[PDB]
């Protein structure tokens, strides 16, 4: 009974064979990442500590995130047999289902109403 990862319950990086690596290429990658991160940290702190700053600090990564999740979608969208089918179902499937639901329920109702056998004792307001 040893741990089995899952897309939500992930691997704690202590059972990952990629952390128990002494390979110099991997370590060079790690060092490059720390270099990038320290460069960005210094670029951020030179503003966060600038006493000649009267405005907030603009974050271009966030701007890219938003420009990508809203405005960069359609240009980078091309129709496909999967896109089209998922769109078709997502659009016109729930509608069809609920249409037949409501139609059946209301036809049954109005049938009983014209016929009788359905009582509305104290319905006064509808």
């Amino acid at each position: 009974s040893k741990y089995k990862p899952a897309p939500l319950a992930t691997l704690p990086s202590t059972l990952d064979p990629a952390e128990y690596d002494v390979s110099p290429e991997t370590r060079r990658a790690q060092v490059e990442r720390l270099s990038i991160r320290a460069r960005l940290k210094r670029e951020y702190l030179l503003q966060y500590n600038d006493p000649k700053r009267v405005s907030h600090i603009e974050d271009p990564a966030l701007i890219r995130w938003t420009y990508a999740r809203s405005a960069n979608i359609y240009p980078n969208f091309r129709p496909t047999p999967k896109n089209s089918l998922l769109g078709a179902v997502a659009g016109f499937g729930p509608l069809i289902f609920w249409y037949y639901v409501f139609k059946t329920d209301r036809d049954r109702k109005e049938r009983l109403i014209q016929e009788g056998k359905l009582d509305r004792k104290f319905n006064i307001s509808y």
């Binding site: 609920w98 639901v101 409501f102 209301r106 109702k109 509808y126």
Partner: peptide, 13 residues
């Protein structure tokens, strides 16, 4: 309430 009177399956949505 009006919808429920219309069809009792609207309250789900």
């Amino acid at each position: 309430m009006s919808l429920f009177s219309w069809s009792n399956f609207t309250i789900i949505l």
